[PDB]
Symmetry: D2
């Protein structure tokens, strides 16, 4: 068990003044990983005043001075990749085979990416006439807040903090209460890299309290939130009610994976497996509606069954473990309710559908990888995000039908198509209503690539050059060198 975890405000760990605490569990064992202090309303105010003071120092440095500090943090993250991944595995229940290859690697990639773009952040100059011209500045917002989710804790902390800090802001980050531990380590890493005190503060807490105090605080200029749709609506209401903040939201989806009639079904099955069962299905971009041509549906079902039999649950630190428990018992209960609705609504259970039992599983919230087929667009498991290891296989006859059904949803996060045909790939992808589209692949999210949702799946974008700009605000300045004329 670990020592009690404190708040991180202004370059040092510090006790919360709320008097309150919470515990984070190891979802593989049910054991208390650490007791964690919760930030109260006065603690948030202290963090904002720390952040305001740090931000001025940060913004007054040269662009390359900021770049060098963030690249030093990258170097630390590269060195401690395996140690940080192990803590993430303990806190989240995700296999080490995942956390050591993706979570910190792709989080540091984004920090590294933005560190190098700081000197390229530029305004514009616009001539109006010989006697007047306009120039613009891309100024920091000031203090921004990030609210993280529990499925990719440190990756989210890096994907939010990297552009915010690169744009010259200070960020106060509130990790999920399920998974607060890696965010505290990152705050330590930033200071070791030379980040000025206050520029990145971490306030663990419950959403109902610490999160709400951040969304309500009048001196926070922007909120960036990744999480469930319900917690988002609350953040957006309390942020609307309070000071007028720009909000960015990354929510879930029910993303379609469209298998074309000319597609290799081994490739299609491999893509479908990776689009549904990575991180035990707890991934917003997962391709949970798999559309397969009727003529190949049966063969595809067998290929899935063959691959699902290969999934290896077990010791999360073992190299060959590729499947972990869900993050908590309440989350598994919701997944189990969706599975039962699939059975009751007439979907055909192809495999899985039950909790896992036996030594090593009775203490964690394990669900067997599950596949439903013979699914219809009106079934609950097809219409709603489950956030668990549950694939829905749907049959289709023609391209116009599958495009219509793929788009017939309020979600809009991701989509994909499998096809070797040049025209089919681009033609279909261009008609899909989704922000992240993969052709003959799934899941890769390069730092260069803006990612985010259409419709109800999010507001704004992360990664790419545009996200650096979105953590600045434009000031337009007109220089009038001619004589001003008044009509009064």
């Amino acid at each position: 068990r670990m020592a009690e975890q404190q708040l991180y405000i202004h370059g040092k760990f510090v006790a919360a003044t709320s008097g309150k605490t919470f515990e984070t569990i190891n979802p593989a064992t049910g054991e208390v990983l650490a007791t964690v202090q919760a930030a109260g309303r006065e603690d948030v105010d202290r963090a904002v005043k720390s952040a305001q003071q740090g931000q001025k120092v940060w913004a007054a440095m040269s662009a390359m001075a900021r770049s060098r500090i963030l690249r030093k943090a990258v170097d630390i993250l590269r060195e401690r990749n395996d140690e940080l991944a192990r803590l993430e595995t303990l806190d989240t229940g995700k296999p080490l085979s995942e956390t050591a290859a993706v979570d910190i690697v792709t989080g540091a990639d984004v920090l590294e990416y933005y560190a190098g773009l700081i000197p390229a952040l530029e305004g514009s100059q616009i001539p109006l006439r010989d006697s007047s011209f306009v120039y613009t500045r891309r100024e920091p917002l000031g203090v921004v807040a990030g609210i993280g989710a529990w499925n990719y804790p440190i990756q989210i902390a890096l994907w939010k903090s990297a552009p915010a800090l690169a744009a010259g802001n200070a960020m106060i980050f509130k990790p999920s209460e399920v998974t607060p531990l890696t965010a505290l380590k990152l705050a330590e890493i930033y200071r070791e890299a030379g980040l000025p005190d206050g520029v990145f503060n971490v306030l663990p807490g419950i959403g109902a309290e610490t999160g709400q105090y951040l969304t309500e605080h009048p001196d926070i200029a922007k909120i960036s939130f990744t999480g469930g749709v319900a917690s988002g609506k609350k953040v957006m209401a309390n942020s609307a009610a309070s000071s007028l903040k720009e909000v960015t939201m990354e929510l879930g989806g029910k993303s379609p994976l469209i298998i074309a009639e000319d597609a290799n079904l081994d490739l299609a099955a491999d893509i479908a497996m990776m689009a549904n069962f990575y991180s035990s299905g707890q991934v917003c971009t997962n391709g949970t509606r798999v559309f397969v041509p009727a003529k190949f549906k049966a063969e595809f079902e067998h290929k899935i069954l063959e691959r699902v039999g290969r999934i290896r649950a077990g010791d999360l630190f073992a190299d060959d473990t590729n499947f972990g428990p869900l993050v908590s018992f309440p989350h598994r209960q919701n997944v189990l309710r969706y599975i039962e609705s699939g059975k009751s609504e007439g979907a055909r259970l192809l495999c899985g559908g039950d909790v896992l039992k036996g030594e090593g599983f009775d203490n964690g919230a394990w669900v067997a990888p599950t596949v439903f087929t013979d699914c219809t667009d009106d079934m609950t498991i097809v219409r709603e995000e489950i956030f668990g290891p549950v694939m829905s296989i749907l049959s289709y006859d023609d391209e116009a039908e599958v495009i219509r059904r793929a788009n017939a949803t309020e979600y809009g996060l991701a989509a994909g198509v499998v096809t070797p045909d040049l025209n089919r790939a681009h033609r279909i992808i261009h008609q899909l209503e989704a922000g992240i589209c993969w052709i003959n692949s799934w899941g890769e999210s390069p730092a260069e690539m803006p990612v985010g949702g259409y419709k109800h799946s999010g507001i704004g974008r992360e990664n790419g050059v545009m996200t650096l700009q979105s953590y600045t605000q434009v000031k337009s300045i007109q220089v009038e060198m001619g004589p001003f004329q008044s009509i009064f």
Copy 2:
């Protein structure tokens, strides 16, 4: 009085099914200008279904085909400038000297600007490796909604609809109930120009009902709102509780004009006049806090008194008239309550402070140009936006103080400085917390120049190239040409 005005949906005027109507008044005479039908909850759904159909046609056209249509609308607007300005004067009370020279001219300037940029709206391509690359599409949002304010009715309708249409969207526009007439004329002009049916629909109504139905509709992807802070908080809240929509907001301000000790006080007085009394002070960007060095205050007050003396109120269609009534009698009552708060807190009344009386004024919502001096930061008239012809003059001693006091507000819309000194002009402007900054001028808003507020004065920007992009959404597409590797 005009025939009962109807909704404009899908290329034609159509009766509302709400059974509700409202009236718009001429603020110069108290007369009813017209009865106007109010869009019901079902009418909004019809407009959305019309906009969905029109947007598909509009987005399928070539970029240059959309450009030519918008440029045709521009040509119609220029030809009908004088006719449109008169209707605007009748509806708003603004002098024809303003409406004929600014409102349609600057509205059409923005439509003309965006018409030419449509073909330059481009995505990006990013190589990842020999075997994979990414490209992005800037796709239309789909159906967007604009909610207009009453101070610049047709200019606002153009500033919202021009980028929205240029980006490939359809807009449903709800004008302010105080000034609904010019937006309906704009819709006929767009159709006459060749805009497909459904791409620009106008639904008059009330904010509590019609505005809310638009902000609640699940198939509207973005809301752009211009108005008061209070209604903006409501819009953001209802849109949050409802479909997760992109939001843009242009709210009020309490913008500071910083007169420097080396400023020509004649130039400063002329800038202060234009920043406070154009459109009878009903302009969000107005410089309603005028900071003057103590050593120059008495002389500046004298020069202000001189410029107020030249103000020429009267018949709104006379060429020499340069001051009009407020937009409505209820708004005048609010402005009078601010004036009484200024007297009761001890601000010195320099001029004005009362309604205008006599033939041709006793029937209009006239307020005399009003200047308070000896003003202090804590006064209500200095802290709150009045949106009337009320200038507040505040004395300051040194630059650091005036920067702090200028910035010590929840508003963030505009700011300005009067100084011949190179270093002073840029140094001050760079430290001011405002999105729109004028050096030795006020009020000019070129189509090329992004405009919008810091802090509580707004979210997002209007005009400039960036606003065309903000009416698109980014779709990232990864083409994987290498073998896909599954870990299962």
Copy 3:
């Protein structure tokens, strides 16, 4: 018979002072179309002084004022498309079925495109520190010179003049002695649209005299040249020996068309036909090396021969004529010399290979559509550009081989691939060393698409936003608001 054509300098036609003239021939009949005056050194000097005066007026105008003038020119060009095309057909010998559908249509498209972009021409602003910043201006170069080629006379004049004028420069344009007539008409159109006098001047003449005087003139800031490699080298030499001009060149190519093993051979044949025999083969981008898999070559040859037999030479104004004479009789001799080298080097003539004879052809510079097969990479007709209707079909065995052979040339202008396979199309195209690449098509050159040559086929680019910027020069301006510190 037309009247003698004069020089066009400063908004009017004016007599040359060279005392020298030349004739332009109708290539379908041999008759003299018109006598044209040649500009001497003093004529060029007068043109520069005219251009210098007009550029200042043109650049002092607002961006939108420049945009409206160019769009007015577009409107006249659309109205006069048929009349201009008929003149181009008379001067060049290209069928009206081409000139009325392409030459002015796509010329005006580029002018229309750049007209709308003028207001988006923007500099940048870079904050160095609190006390110093940099901003940049994109200023006009001043007076630039364009030297046109004879195959697309008015299109080239528009593609060069449109970005030059839109960037605020004046252009002196020198048309080819073969095709001077439409350039003089374009000058009249610009004046009628409102272009200031001197901003577009046209100086017919010969390359060795008029062309050299322009390339040598000290007050010309940039040269844009389209033509043969030998003439280009002369331009580059005189420009270096003289004042330090920027040169842009669009020279010839020997562009490969790669037919993949999975391509439909009817599509491949249609693309190859359009890539070789449009404008009688007189196109720099033509796909004159057609690479076909060995196993499909015989079937491809049959499809080519069937299509070549459909080619309709005849009256260039007849609707169904789709093949014209070469631009001149000296050019036909060069093409016939190449055809004889193909025969003598052992290439197999599949069709054509001789002049056309009979009523209607005997007086024209006609060459039959010619196809060689069994070609090898060492043959003269394969290594050198012919600029006539001569296709070379080359067999290949594998993808790596065809990429090497496609790239094994000093030319680098265009290339294309025919394949329905997603991976093959992008993978091959990414390895081809050419600036213009077509997948499953040929010849389309949208205004938005930058076009130009790799290696010896050109310097710089035309069209796209980047070409507007290339007709400006960057001025960087640092504003230092802090104290300057000298080490001396």
Copy 4:
């Protein structure tokens, strides 16, 4: 020790059989003998670069970035060592070389390293059934030809964008100052740069430079030097394979002192614009335009400033003035100084070589200021490239602008004024690519720099220069049915 060529990640003997010497300008002694790359050597470097460029371009963008940042870290750690070698080769005080030459060279490499992942093409929809996308592809093999005033900085400013864009560069340093370019090649290899990506071929411009400009497989030339040498480069590149050329030439930059200017500030700016690096800097404000009403005061102030100049041991901390790059170069500067007297200019100071212990053996020229200068004197119209300030008087703003602009040069310009309108108004009318307001000489990596008119072609630094080391490929994907008219 006989310095050799650097090709494919190792030092290699030249196959020319020719050599040259570089002199320490402070002592007249030979610093080192350097081998000169011949015609076979140029073909070798190009063939090596072609092989290396594919490895380099095949890496990820971040892989290239990390290698370039490792080179930066080595350069910082070796700043003092490299600066000393630069001082020996150029005669610039260590106080300069340790603070500017490598510092500002590395800054540009560091800047471009971070931008590699942001180098992006474009995507343009044409219609539902067709779209276009563009790739920004490496040119391949490019060549840089450096000047002698800032040897390593020029090598970094040329090689950084070239390598960042995915090209290999062959760099030919000036024969006057070839030594630091070879250390840089070593540093790049140590940082992990693939072999062949940065090859260095010392030699003579008449031979080695020509062989680079004539080689058919070099896609672009970037040249910094004098106008005459540039015209030769451009001719040979014209007569040869069709190359993109970039040139950064000299200037006769004006420094305009306004009526409301503080003359202490103006004098400081004028000192740094004329006498830094002993006045051998292309952006130097050699024409200092001063109001007649202030000329006498400014002259006093110049004499006050010129008196603090401390010539001496180039490794001494307080030294701020060095010898010229070579004794032959000194004769040309002295030839210009004699022309001001013959042309009637009043010599306010300097104008001779320096003498005594420690100066008789160096290529010293005294800091020189002429006043009573006229627009027609040779020293006012032509670049001297030595420590010679020309003071010119003016009466009205239009005159100084036209006179400032009345030149074929267009490199830099500056104005000294506290007035908002005059700075922007004057600067917007000056025909120069590099304009400083109330300062001089600062050249941030972010700021594009280059000449108007005869002072250069193209630009260096800034994001645009990264793109200019790429070539655009446009690709149309036609998904509709293709229609032939035959």
